[PDB]
Design a protein around this nucleic acid. Sequence first.
DNA 1: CATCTG
DNA 2: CAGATG
Length: 327
Amino acid sequence: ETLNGGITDMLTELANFEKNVSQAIHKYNAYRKAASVIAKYPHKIKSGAEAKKLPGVGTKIAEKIDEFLATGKLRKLEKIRQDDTSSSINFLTRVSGIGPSAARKFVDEGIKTLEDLRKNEDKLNHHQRIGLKYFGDFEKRIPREEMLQMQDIVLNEVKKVDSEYIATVCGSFRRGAESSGDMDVLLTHPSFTSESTKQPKLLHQVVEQLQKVHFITDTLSKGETKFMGVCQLPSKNDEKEYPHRRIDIRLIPKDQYYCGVLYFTGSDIFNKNMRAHALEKGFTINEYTIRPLGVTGVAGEPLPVDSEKDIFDYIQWKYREPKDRSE
DNA sequence: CATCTG
DNA sequence: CAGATG
Ligand code: NA
Ligand code: NA
Protein backbone atom coordinates (compact mmCIF):
# COMPACT_ATOMS: atom_id res chain seq x y z
CA GLU A 1 0.00 0.00 0.00
CA THR A 2 3.12 2.18 0.34
CA LEU A 3 5.71 -0.42 0.74
CA ASN A 4 6.00 -1.14 -2.97
CA GLY A 5 4.23 1.98 -4.35
CA GLY A 6 7.08 3.12 -6.69
CA ILE A 7 7.20 -0.24 -8.28
CA THR A 8 3.56 -0.37 -8.49
CA ASP A 9 3.32 3.01 -9.93
CA MET A 10 6.07 2.62 -12.53
CA LEU A 11 4.61 -0.76 -13.61
CA THR A 12 1.21 0.95 -14.02
CA GLU A 13 2.94 3.71 -16.12
CA LEU A 14 4.48 1.16 -18.36
CA ALA A 15 1.31 -0.88 -18.52
CA ASN A 16 -0.71 2.07 -19.59
CA PHE A 17 1.73 2.96 -22.18
CA GLU A 18 1.69 -0.40 -23.94
CA LYS A 19 -1.93 -0.37 -24.18
CA ASN A 20 -2.34 3.43 -25.15
CA VAL A 21 0.60 4.10 -27.51
CA SER A 22 1.76 0.72 -28.53
CA GLN A 23 -0.81 -1.66 -29.16
CA ALA A 24 0.66 -4.22 -26.71
CA ILE A 25 -2.37 -5.50 -24.95
CA HIS A 26 -0.35 -8.56 -23.96
CA LYS A 27 2.45 -6.48 -22.56
CA TYR A 28 -0.05 -4.11 -21.23
CA ASN A 29 -1.78 -6.87 -19.43
CA ALA A 30 1.65 -8.04 -18.39
CA TYR A 31 2.42 -4.98 -16.25
CA ARG A 32 -0.99 -5.23 -14.71
CA LYS A 33 -0.87 -8.49 -12.94
CA ALA A 34 2.65 -7.68 -11.97
CA ALA A 35 1.55 -4.60 -10.22
CA SER A 36 -1.38 -6.37 -8.80
CA VAL A 37 0.80 -9.01 -7.34
CA ILE A 38 3.68 -6.86 -6.11
CA ALA A 39 0.81 -4.82 -4.68
CA LYS A 40 -0.38 -7.52 -2.27
CA TYR A 41 3.19 -8.48 -1.41
CA PRO A 42 3.73 -8.06 2.27
CA HIS A 43 7.38 -7.14 2.22
CA LYS A 44 9.80 -4.47 1.02
CA ILE A 45 10.97 -5.49 -2.37
CA LYS A 46 14.63 -5.08 -2.07
CA SER A 47 15.57 -6.41 -5.45
CA GLY A 48 14.63 -7.68 -8.81
CA ALA A 49 15.30 -11.28 -8.07
CA GLU A 50 13.20 -11.08 -5.02
CA ALA A 51 10.46 -9.83 -7.08
CA LYS A 52 10.99 -12.31 -9.88
CA LYS A 53 10.15 -14.77 -7.29
CA LEU A 54 6.62 -13.69 -7.66
CA PRO A 55 4.09 -15.02 -10.20
CA GLY A 56 3.53 -12.71 -13.11
CA VAL A 57 7.00 -11.52 -12.52
CA GLY A 58 9.36 -12.30 -15.19
CA THR A 59 12.86 -11.45 -16.18
CA LYS A 60 11.98 -8.27 -17.99
CA ILE A 61 10.12 -6.81 -15.18
CA ALA A 62 12.65 -7.93 -12.73
CA GLU A 63 15.13 -6.10 -14.85
CA LYS A 64 13.16 -3.03 -14.64
CA ILE A 65 12.66 -3.14 -10.88
CA ASP A 66 16.38 -3.25 -10.48
CA GLU A 67 17.05 -0.02 -12.40
CA PHE A 68 14.38 1.54 -10.57
CA LEU A 69 15.61 0.36 -7.20
CA ALA A 70 19.20 0.98 -8.24
CA THR A 71 18.47 4.63 -9.44
CA GLY A 72 15.44 6.90 -8.86
CA LYS A 73 14.37 6.46 -12.31
CA LEU A 74 13.85 4.38 -15.34
CA ARG A 75 15.31 5.30 -18.82
CA LYS A 76 12.24 3.90 -20.60
CA LEU A 77 10.00 5.80 -18.28
CA GLU A 78 12.16 8.72 -19.02
CA LYS A 79 12.17 8.34 -22.77
CA ILE A 80 8.26 7.91 -22.95
CA ARG A 81 7.48 10.94 -20.63
CA GLN A 82 9.22 13.05 -23.23
CA ASP A 83 8.20 11.75 -26.59
CA ASP A 84 5.75 14.07 -28.07
CA THR A 85 3.91 11.31 -29.87
CA SER A 86 3.23 9.46 -26.75
CA SER A 87 2.09 12.62 -25.10
CA SER A 88 -0.25 13.52 -27.80
CA ILE A 89 -2.05 10.38 -27.38
CA ASN A 90 -2.47 10.89 -23.68
CA PHE A 91 -3.89 14.23 -24.32
CA LEU A 92 -6.25 13.61 -27.20
CA THR A 93 -7.80 10.84 -25.27
CA ARG A 94 -8.95 13.46 -22.82
CA VAL A 95 -11.60 14.40 -25.22
CA SER A 96 -14.82 12.65 -24.80
CA GLY A 97 -15.17 10.45 -27.71
CA ILE A 98 -11.56 9.98 -28.54
CA GLY A 99 -10.11 6.73 -27.44
CA PRO A 100 -6.61 5.55 -28.04
CA SER A 101 -7.42 4.14 -31.32
CA ALA A 102 -8.65 7.41 -32.57
CA ALA A 103 -5.85 9.28 -30.88
CA ARG A 104 -3.39 7.25 -32.91
CA LYS A 105 -5.10 8.12 -36.19
CA PHE A 106 -5.22 11.88 -35.58
CA VAL A 107 -1.61 12.00 -34.49
CA ASP A 108 -0.56 10.32 -37.55
CA GLU A 109 -2.44 12.84 -39.29
CA GLY A 110 -0.72 15.50 -37.30
CA ILE A 111 -3.60 16.51 -35.08
CA LYS A 112 -1.97 16.72 -31.79
CA THR A 113 -3.68 19.43 -29.93
CA LEU A 114 -6.84 21.23 -29.11
CA GLU A 115 -6.31 23.62 -31.90
CA ASP A 116 -5.53 20.88 -34.33
CA LEU A 117 -8.74 19.44 -33.48
CA ARG A 118 -10.80 22.61 -34.04
CA LYS A 119 -9.15 23.12 -37.40
CA ASN A 120 -10.20 19.69 -38.28
CA GLU A 121 -13.66 19.51 -36.82
CA ASP A 122 -14.59 17.95 -40.05
CA LYS A 123 -12.75 14.81 -39.12
CA LEU A 124 -14.48 14.30 -35.85
CA ASN A 125 -17.89 12.69 -35.33
CA HIS A 126 -20.82 14.00 -33.27
CA HIS A 127 -19.80 12.70 -29.82
CA GLN A 128 -16.25 13.78 -30.47
CA ARG A 129 -17.44 17.11 -31.42
CA ILE A 130 -19.49 17.70 -28.44
CA GLY A 131 -16.55 16.54 -26.47
CA LEU A 132 -14.40 19.10 -28.15
CA LYS A 133 -16.79 21.82 -27.49
CA TYR A 134 -17.12 21.03 -23.84
CA PHE A 135 -13.52 20.09 -23.02
CA GLY A 136 -13.17 22.42 -20.14
CA ASP A 137 -16.72 22.09 -18.68
CA PHE A 138 -16.19 18.43 -19.06
CA GLU A 139 -13.20 18.22 -16.92
CA LYS A 140 -14.75 20.33 -14.18
CA ARG A 141 -15.79 18.56 -11.12
CA ILE A 142 -19.50 18.85 -10.08
CA PRO A 143 -20.13 20.39 -6.66
CA ARG A 144 -23.01 18.88 -4.61
CA GLU A 145 -24.53 22.23 -4.37
CA GLU A 146 -25.29 21.98 -8.14
CA MET A 147 -25.89 18.25 -7.95
CA LEU A 148 -29.01 19.02 -5.69
CA GLN A 149 -30.18 21.74 -8.08
CA MET A 150 -29.96 19.17 -10.92
CA GLN A 151 -31.53 16.40 -9.00
CA ASP A 152 -34.30 18.76 -8.17
CA ILE A 153 -35.04 19.38 -11.73
CA VAL A 154 -34.84 15.91 -13.14
CA LEU A 155 -37.07 14.37 -10.45
CA ASN A 156 -39.64 17.09 -10.83
CA GLU A 157 -39.84 16.69 -14.59
CA VAL A 158 -39.96 12.93 -14.42
CA LYS A 159 -42.83 13.21 -11.96
CA LYS A 160 -44.79 15.36 -14.32
CA VAL A 161 -44.60 13.03 -17.27
CA ASP A 162 -45.70 10.02 -15.22
CA SER A 163 -46.46 9.76 -11.49
CA GLU A 164 -45.38 6.24 -11.77
CA TYR A 165 -41.73 6.81 -12.76
CA ILE A 166 -39.04 6.07 -10.25
CA ALA A 167 -35.81 7.90 -10.57
CA THR A 168 -32.86 7.71 -8.41
CA VAL A 169 -29.57 9.50 -8.62
CA CYS A 170 -26.84 7.10 -7.76
CA GLY A 171 -23.14 7.63 -7.66
CA SER A 172 -21.04 9.02 -4.85
CA PHE A 173 -23.63 11.81 -4.95
CA ARG A 174 -25.76 9.15 -3.36
CA ARG A 175 -23.01 8.08 -0.86
CA GLY A 176 -22.56 11.64 0.41
CA ALA A 177 -19.62 13.02 -1.75
CA GLU A 178 -18.98 16.77 -1.86
CA SER A 179 -18.59 16.85 -5.59
CA SER A 180 -18.99 14.47 -8.41
CA GLY A 181 -17.92 13.87 -11.91
CA ASP A 182 -21.36 13.44 -13.66
CA MET A 183 -24.99 12.89 -13.16
CA ASP A 184 -26.10 9.19 -13.25
CA VAL A 185 -29.78 8.51 -13.08
CA LEU A 186 -31.46 5.03 -12.58
CA LEU A 187 -34.87 4.77 -14.08
CA THR A 188 -37.79 2.40 -13.89
CA HIS A 189 -41.47 2.08 -14.16
CA PRO A 190 -43.93 -0.52 -12.85
CA SER A 191 -44.95 -1.15 -16.35
CA PHE A 192 -41.45 -2.38 -17.28
CA THR A 193 -39.73 -5.44 -16.35
CA SER A 194 -37.86 -8.57 -17.02
CA GLU A 195 -40.47 -10.31 -19.18
CA SER A 196 -42.51 -7.24 -20.21
CA THR A 197 -41.69 -6.69 -23.69
CA LYS A 198 -40.07 -3.36 -24.00
CA GLN A 199 -41.30 0.11 -23.94
CA PRO A 200 -38.76 2.52 -25.34
CA LYS A 201 -41.16 5.35 -24.96
CA LEU A 202 -40.66 4.67 -21.31
CA LEU A 203 -37.30 6.34 -21.65
CA HIS A 204 -37.77 8.66 -24.71
CA GLN A 205 -40.57 10.50 -23.04
CA VAL A 206 -38.49 11.69 -20.17
CA VAL A 207 -35.57 12.72 -22.31
CA GLU A 208 -37.86 14.86 -24.21
CA GLN A 209 -39.15 16.56 -21.19
CA LEU A 210 -35.75 17.27 -20.02
CA GLN A 211 -34.92 18.93 -23.27
CA LYS A 212 -38.32 20.48 -23.44
CA VAL A 213 -37.45 22.49 -20.46
CA HIS A 214 -33.73 22.86 -21.52
CA PHE A 215 -32.01 20.93 -19.02
CA ILE A 216 -30.62 18.56 -21.54
CA THR A 217 -28.61 20.30 -24.21
CA ASP A 218 -27.10 17.62 -26.40
CA THR A 219 -27.45 13.93 -27.06
CA LEU A 220 -24.25 11.87 -27.10
CA SER A 221 -26.02 8.66 -27.61
CA LYS A 222 -29.64 7.83 -27.31
CA GLY A 223 -30.78 4.24 -27.33
CA GLU A 224 -33.76 2.49 -26.11
CA THR A 225 -32.62 2.04 -22.57
CA LYS A 226 -29.63 4.22 -22.11
CA PHE A 227 -29.33 7.81 -22.90
CA MET A 228 -25.90 9.67 -22.87
CA GLY A 229 -26.37 13.42 -22.76
CA VAL A 230 -25.22 16.89 -21.71
CA CYS A 231 -27.29 18.92 -19.28
CA GLN A 232 -27.16 22.37 -17.90
CA LEU A 233 -28.53 24.31 -15.01
CA PRO A 234 -30.21 27.41 -16.33
CA SER A 235 -28.20 30.43 -16.03
CA LYS A 236 -30.06 32.42 -13.33
CA ASN A 237 -29.90 36.13 -13.69
CA ASP A 238 -27.27 36.53 -16.52
CA GLU A 239 -23.67 36.95 -15.29
CA LYS A 240 -23.08 33.38 -14.25
CA GLU A 241 -24.07 30.56 -16.58
CA TYR A 242 -23.15 27.01 -15.53
CA PRO A 243 -20.65 24.67 -17.01
CA HIS A 244 -22.04 21.91 -19.23
CA ARG A 245 -22.41 18.55 -17.47
CA ARG A 246 -22.37 14.93 -18.45
CA ILE A 247 -25.38 12.95 -17.73
CA ASP A 248 -26.72 9.44 -18.17
CA ILE A 249 -30.22 8.21 -17.96
CA ARG A 250 -30.89 4.50 -17.98
CA LEU A 251 -34.10 2.49 -17.95
CA ILE A 252 -34.35 -0.66 -15.80
CA PRO A 253 -37.09 -3.18 -15.49
CA LYS A 254 -38.72 -2.55 -12.29
CA ASP A 255 -38.01 -6.07 -11.19
CA GLN A 256 -34.27 -5.28 -11.09
CA TYR A 257 -34.05 -1.78 -9.86
CA TYR A 258 -32.71 -2.03 -6.33
CA CYS A 259 -29.81 -4.30 -7.18
CA GLY A 260 -28.82 -1.83 -9.79
CA VAL A 261 -29.46 0.93 -7.51
CA LEU A 262 -27.51 -0.74 -4.85
CA TYR A 263 -24.85 -1.58 -7.19
CA PHE A 264 -24.36 1.78 -8.88
CA THR A 265 -24.24 3.50 -5.54
CA GLY A 266 -21.04 1.65 -4.85
CA SER A 267 -18.41 2.09 -3.75
CA ASP A 268 -16.55 -0.71 -5.53
CA ILE A 269 -15.15 -1.85 -2.16
CA PHE A 270 -18.53 -1.73 -0.47
CA ASN A 271 -19.85 -3.86 -3.27
CA LYS A 272 -17.26 -6.45 -3.10
CA ASN A 273 -17.57 -6.91 0.63
CA MET A 274 -21.26 -7.11 0.36
CA ARG A 275 -20.78 -9.48 -2.44
CA ALA A 276 -18.54 -11.83 -0.56
CA HIS A 277 -20.75 -11.77 2.48
CA ALA A 278 -23.82 -12.57 0.29
CA LEU A 279 -21.79 -15.45 -0.84
CA GLU A 280 -21.38 -16.45 2.71
CA LYS A 281 -24.97 -16.04 3.75
CA GLY A 282 -25.64 -18.62 0.89
CA PHE A 283 -26.11 -16.00 -1.94
CA THR A 284 -25.30 -14.32 -5.14
CA ILE A 285 -25.35 -10.79 -6.33
CA ASN A 286 -24.62 -8.79 -9.35
CA GLU A 287 -25.88 -5.80 -11.04
CA TYR A 288 -29.57 -7.17 -11.63
CA THR A 289 -30.39 -9.72 -8.96
CA ILE A 290 -29.73 -11.76 -5.84
CA ARG A 291 -30.01 -15.52 -6.17
CA PRO A 292 -30.05 -18.26 -3.52
CA LEU A 293 -27.03 -20.39 -3.97
CA GLY A 294 -27.54 -24.07 -4.50
CA VAL A 295 -24.91 -26.41 -3.18
CA THR A 296 -24.13 -28.55 -6.31
CA GLY A 297 -21.70 -25.90 -7.12
CA VAL A 298 -23.89 -23.12 -8.01
CA ALA A 299 -27.48 -22.56 -8.75
CA GLY A 300 -29.95 -19.80 -9.63
CA GLU A 301 -33.41 -18.24 -9.33
CA PRO A 302 -34.18 -14.51 -8.61
CA LEU A 303 -35.02 -13.62 -5.14
CA PRO A 304 -37.74 -10.94 -5.00
CA VAL A 305 -36.64 -7.37 -3.94
CA ASP A 306 -38.82 -4.21 -3.11
CA SER A 307 -35.94 -2.08 -1.75
CA GLU A 308 -32.25 -2.03 -0.92
CA LYS A 309 -33.60 -3.37 2.36
CA ASP A 310 -34.81 -6.61 0.85
CA ILE A 311 -31.31 -7.22 -0.32
CA PHE A 312 -29.46 -6.74 2.97
CA ASP A 313 -32.22 -8.64 4.76
CA TYR A 314 -31.56 -11.50 2.48
CA ILE A 315 -27.89 -11.67 3.29
CA GLN A 316 -28.89 -10.92 6.84
CA TRP A 317 -27.03 -7.68 7.42
CA LYS A 318 -27.08 -4.19 8.79
CA TYR A 319 -28.99 -1.85 6.45
CA ARG A 320 -26.46 0.61 5.36
CA GLU A 321 -27.29 4.18 4.79
CA PRO A 322 -25.80 5.18 1.56
CA LYS A 323 -23.28 7.48 3.27
CA ASP A 324 -21.64 4.56 5.14
CA ARG A 325 -21.61 2.46 2.00
CA SER A 326 -18.05 3.59 1.88
CA GLU A 327 -16.02 0.43 2.51
C1' DC B 1 -22.73 -3.74 -22.02
C1' DA B 2 -25.23 -0.58 -25.22
C1' DT B 3 -24.68 2.57 -28.80
C1' DC B 4 -22.51 4.52 -32.92
C1' DT B 5 -19.94 4.51 -37.19
C1' DG B 6 -18.83 3.32 -41.55
C1' DC C 1 -20.82 -6.67 -39.68
C1' DA C 2 -16.39 -5.59 -36.51
C1' DG C 3 -14.46 -2.38 -33.76
C1' DA C 4 -14.52 1.80 -30.79
C1' DT C 5 -16.07 4.43 -26.89
C1' DG C 6 -17.95 5.40 -22.13
NA1 NA D 1 -11.59 10.16 -24.48
NA1 NA E 1 -10.15 -9.98 -34.73
